[PDB]
Amino acid sequence: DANPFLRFSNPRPSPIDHTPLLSTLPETRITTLPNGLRVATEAIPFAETTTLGIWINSGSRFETDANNGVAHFLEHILFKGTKNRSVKELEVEVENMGGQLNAYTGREQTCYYAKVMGKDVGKAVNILSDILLNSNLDARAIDKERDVILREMEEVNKQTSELVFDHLHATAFQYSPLGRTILGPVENIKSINRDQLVEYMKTHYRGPRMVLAAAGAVNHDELVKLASDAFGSVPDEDAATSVRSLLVKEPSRFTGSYVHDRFPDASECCMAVAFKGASWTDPDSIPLMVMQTMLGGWDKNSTVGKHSSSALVQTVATEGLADAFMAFNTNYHDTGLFGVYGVTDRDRSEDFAYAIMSNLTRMCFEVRDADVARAKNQLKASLMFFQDSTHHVAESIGRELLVYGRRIPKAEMFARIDAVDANAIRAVADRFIYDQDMAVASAGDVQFVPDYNWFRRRSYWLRY
Amino acid sequence: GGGRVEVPLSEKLPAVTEPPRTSTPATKPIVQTSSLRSGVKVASINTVSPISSLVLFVEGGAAAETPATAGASKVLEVAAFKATANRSTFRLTRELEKIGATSFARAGRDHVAFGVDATRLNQLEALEILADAVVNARYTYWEVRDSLDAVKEQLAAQLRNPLTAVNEVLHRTAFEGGLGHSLVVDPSVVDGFTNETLKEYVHSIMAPSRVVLAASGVDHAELTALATPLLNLHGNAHPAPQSRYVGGAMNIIAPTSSLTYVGLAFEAKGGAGDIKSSAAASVVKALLDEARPTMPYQRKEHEVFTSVNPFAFAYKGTGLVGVVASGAPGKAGKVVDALTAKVQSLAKGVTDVQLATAKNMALGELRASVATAPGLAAAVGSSVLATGKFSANEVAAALSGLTAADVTSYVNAMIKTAPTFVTYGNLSSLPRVDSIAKRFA
Amino acid sequence: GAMNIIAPTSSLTYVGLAFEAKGGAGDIKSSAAASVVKALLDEARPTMPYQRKEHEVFTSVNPFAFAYKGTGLVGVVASGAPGKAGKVVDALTAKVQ
Amino acid sequence: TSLLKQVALPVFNSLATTYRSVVGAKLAKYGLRFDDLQDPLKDEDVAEALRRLPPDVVVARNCRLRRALDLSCKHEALPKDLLEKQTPELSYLQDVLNEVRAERRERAQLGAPAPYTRIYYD
Numbered sequence A: 001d002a003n004p005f006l007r008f009s010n011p012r013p014s015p016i017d018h019t020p021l022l023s024t025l026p027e028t029r030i031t032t033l034p035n036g037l038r039v040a041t042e043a044i045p046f047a048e049t050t051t052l053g054i055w056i057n058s059g060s061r062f063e064t065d066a067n068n069g070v071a072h073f074l075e076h077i078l079f080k081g082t083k084n085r086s087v088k089e090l091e092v093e094v095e096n097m098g099g100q101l102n103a104y105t106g107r108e109q110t111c112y113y114a115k116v117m118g119k120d121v122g123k124a125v126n127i128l129s130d131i132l133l134n135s136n137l138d139a140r141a142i143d144k145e146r147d148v149i150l151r152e153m154e155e156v157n158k159q160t161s162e163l164v165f166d167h168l169h170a171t172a173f174q175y176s177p178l179g180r181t182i183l184g185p186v187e188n189i190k191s192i193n194r195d196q197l198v199e200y201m202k203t204h205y206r207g208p209r210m211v212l213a214a215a216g217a218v219n220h221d222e223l224v225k226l227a228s229d230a231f232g233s234v235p236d237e238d239a240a241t242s243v244r245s246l247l248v249k250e251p252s253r254f255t256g257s258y259v260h261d262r263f264p265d266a267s268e269c270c271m272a273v274a275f276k277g278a279s280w281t282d283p284d285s286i287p288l289m290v291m292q293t294m295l296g297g298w299d300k301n302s303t304v305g306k307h308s309s310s311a312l313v314q315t316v317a318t319e320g321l322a323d324a325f326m327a328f329n330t331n332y333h334d335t336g337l338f339g340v341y342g343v344t345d346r347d348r349s350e351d352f353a354y355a356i357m358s359n360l361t362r363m364c365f366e367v368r369d370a371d372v373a374r375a376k377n378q379l380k381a382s383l384m385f386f387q388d389s390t391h392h393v394a395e396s397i398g399r400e401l402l403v404y405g406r407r408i409p410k411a412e413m414f415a416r417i418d419a420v421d422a423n424a425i426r427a428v429a430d431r432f433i434y435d436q437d438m439a440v441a442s443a444g445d446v447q448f449v450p451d452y453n454w455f456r457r458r459s460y461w462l463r464y
Numbered sequence B: 001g002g003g004r005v006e007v008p009l010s011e012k013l014p015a016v017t018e019p020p021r022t023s024t025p026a027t028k029p030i031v032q033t034s035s036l037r038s039g040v041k042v043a044s045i046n047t048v049s050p051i052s053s054l055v056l057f058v059e060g061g062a063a064a065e066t067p068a069t070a071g072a073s074k075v076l077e078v079a080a081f082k083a084t085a086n087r088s089t090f091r092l093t094r095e096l097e098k099i100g101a102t103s104f105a106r107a108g109r110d111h112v113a114f115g116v117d118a119t120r121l122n123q124l125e126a127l128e129i130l131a132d133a134v135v136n137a138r139y140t141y142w143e144v145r146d147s148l149d150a151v152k153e154q155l156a157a158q159l160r161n162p163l164t165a166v167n168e169v170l171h172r173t174a175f176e177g178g179l180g181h182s183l184v185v186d187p188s189v190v191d192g193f194t195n196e197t198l199k200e201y202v203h204s205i206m207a208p209s210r211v212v213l214a215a216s217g218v219d220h221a222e223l224t225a226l227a228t229p230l231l232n233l234h235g236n237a238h239p240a241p242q243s244r245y246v247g248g249a250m251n252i253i254a255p256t257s258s259l260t261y262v263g264l265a266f267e268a269k270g271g272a273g274d275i276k277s278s279a280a281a282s283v284v285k286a287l288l289d290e291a292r293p294t295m296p297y298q299r300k301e302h303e304v305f306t307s308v309n310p311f312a313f314a315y316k317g318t319g320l321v322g323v324v325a326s327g328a329p330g331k332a333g334k335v336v337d338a339l340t341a342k343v344q345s346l347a348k349g350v351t352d353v354q355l356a357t358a359k360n361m362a363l364g365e366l367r368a369s370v371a372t373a374p375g376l377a378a379a380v381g382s383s384v385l386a387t388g389k390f391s392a393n394e395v396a397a398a399l400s401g402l403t404a405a406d407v408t409s410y411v412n413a414m415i416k417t418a419p420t421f422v423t424y425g426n427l428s429s430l431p432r433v434d435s436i437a438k439r440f441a
Numbered sequence C: 001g002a003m004n005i006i007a008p009t010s011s012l013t014y015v016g017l018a019f020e021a022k023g024g025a026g027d028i029k030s031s032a033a034a035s036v037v038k039a040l041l042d043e044a045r046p047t048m049p050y051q052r053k054e055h056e057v058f059t060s061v062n063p064f065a066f067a068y069k070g071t072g073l074v075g076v077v078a079s080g081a082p083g084k085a086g087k088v089v090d091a092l093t094a095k096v097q
Numbered sequence D: 001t002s003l004l005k006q007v008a009l010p011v012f013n014s015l016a017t018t019y020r021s022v023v024g025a026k027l028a029k030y031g032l033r034f035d036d037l038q039d040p041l042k043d044e045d046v047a048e049a050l051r052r053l054p055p056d057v058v059v060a061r062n063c064r065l066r067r068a069l070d071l072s073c074k075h076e077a078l079p080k081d082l083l084e085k086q087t088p089e090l091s092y093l094q095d096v097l098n099e100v101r102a103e104r105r106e107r108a109q110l111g112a113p114a115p116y117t118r119i120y121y122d
């Protein structure tokens, strides 16, 4: 019992008031161009590097069966030259800035962002608008990229978690727009050309579906002037092709189902169990974030898994039921996914599945106040760690503007998180998990993974 | 009931703006340094970020490893933040997880770092946990024994990368002394390892003059007042096995490697103490980086270089700068030829656009490495441990003030020293060991 | 030429030195001279039970003389302590000289 | 209770020393110690404490148990020269077992279980 070492710290979880953090947090300033494009900035007081880019409310959900995979091919082709810059000129102009260009295509969201210093914001705006609005889309480069994509299709070159989550989306949201994969099938890749790319760009990359977000060392009004100079030729909405109308026309559907992808000689077994989650606008999405923190995650590179405050991590680490796992919480415009993904062996598949199902169903009856308080503190601390990085602040601005229609102040997010208690967690788990159909996807050595009726019976307890 | 307000809607009118705005500090914050009575240097910088980082830097690493205590830095990396004299492993893990804080241990070539990153509201907890975990650590027999399989599998995972192996052989070949000791050791080295070996290594590296407490995002006076009764370190300053560049040539055989790697390196004279030489080494590393992908799905194609990775290391008194290039097993002689001819192409002269490009690349890496609170705290700690002070503004000013004459003369003086050749894989086309050393002449 | 090998748990250190036997197995006289050189490099030949020949630096000496078609390889491989490898090289060069 | 519980501890200590004298006289003829009387099958904390031990201590404990069981089969005791050397109260397990039980008591106040179960066979 050292006097200097055993003060101010103890392992008993208590609620922590995060209010004095918000005084020093920067504010976000949002303007709107006449075409509907929003420019939002958050100025960090002493920063040197800045990240910035365009967040587009579009993705593989808003495609058809004829042009599936046009949005992923766009990020393959959009950096091969423009009408004003060639390949080498674009290369030297990017590398003169001392930074990076990166793109990410999702199902409901696309990003084209850059990471530069504070003195190269205007050049980054100019090159981003030039890439997005004035690209060549050369047929020769399309033919060169198609061979690479087709070779990696025929080699079956994919991450295992990506394969599992794609199978889970395709079986959970079957006969829905969200069921398609981002990369698309072999036939659409083999039969794609310039005109489908052009029509996708002209249809979906409109004014009010795009947000110009920057964070770090950036001035607001100067960025507004640059954005009005560069992105002013972006067309506006047609009323028949708004995001809300497209959502209403082709909604999402969830079906309880099973899929596995069995290989003859595979060392690992990767499985995911998912329930129908919440959308971005659902008020119960915040308790789903708290529950995702409560379940937690673990990998075998950590030697203190047995001392974890999460019961699922405790069981998996103590019994050695898996190599790695992580609970997920995906949100979409009208639906979502919630559950546990993990990597294990064929001899531990049933035990890992029972651990997952028993830890999910227990949250409908047995929730302790200490675990809720601990998970809320972990959630707020993880939210503060995203504020430390400019890239996460810019991504947060773009995503929050695209999916909520506003920028949520950190005080409101903290007040929403602080309103979740054990009763709310019990009620949300009772609504979303208890005696409901689920979707199960698997890959690899999956001969000992239980079938759908085994999973379905363990959503409820007959003992109560 | 729970909240029923939709997320696009704002929350209820009882949403108190309890935080009051104003004021940001009018000046850019700077690093303050103040030693303690035991001799511990405390170096902290205040930051507007809401994350406080606290890193403890201890001199040592692979340089302080004897043949008795080989591989002890990796095991100390894995076995840190376990049970102490005041806390068990369970209590310490729960205390870290309660406030949502993360801890790490990291072993370098000439140092070992321990750190806890946390919220600014919980900086005292982070400081006390880090102080107890480094000072009062009980390296028990069973906890050290149960981690050796994790250490061995992590070492085997690290040696699967040929770049890590080529880096180890380069550091051994270029140096004589503590800097030539292997850091990422073979897993068979940690076979007969016990907690007494770890205790011996920790006792050899621990002294109050070899320890730097760095921080980011905290008041300096409060940090010194609270670290006064915690960092009462007592120990003997063991002699440092100082190192000198000697160069040479060595080869490592991999019978089932589909790519043959070639490593070339030169001594960065002066080390981290010389700001100008460090800036010139950073610029040369940026110049040699031929294929840096700055855009998604870029399709750069070299005739012989499958992959090119330059490096620049800065230690206390010396360092390395050079390049490691891979290639086909049947194309290794041309890989050596292109790697050799590239440095005379650099020594002959650099254009103003190329110099501006490399200076912007190096300045971007330098100002990106300190953009986060843990990265800033790590840079402060590494600089104070190596040279006694931290100032990246001087490093940036030296990078900005570099002319083409400075870089040309630096590379000309660098080519007048000994080279270093390291080859990985199956060497069925290694032309001559003596002639490639005489190509620079 | 010259090369190297990296062995992680080798308790000793091995050094090989070799030359070319001109003519290979085709020339009788050159192969005979190479065999005589191999025997001349035999420092510690175990001709008696339990005899302890002590060298200052070496732990083992093992020469050879291979005679392939058209070319050969006569030489010697000597072991030694890990900290005395330069002494092993110096002693081998001194023996050939 | 506190007025009489101040001096109830020396009487406990005297009874404990008398008990250990009698039982250690019984134990020393078999070559056993007091810590050898703890079964990993009977207690999961003892099973946890036994795997925290260095291998030579476990080898010595197994050797002592094997010698005692052989003596019990033969209806014999140790000879006088071995019997005079026996140290029945030299602990090898009490520190580790006390640490294990303290850890389990610490985890239980926070609602956590022990990170081990009983030994289960078949």
Ligand SMILES: [Zn+2]
Residues within 6 Å of the ligand: A149
């Ligand atoms: Zn791809």
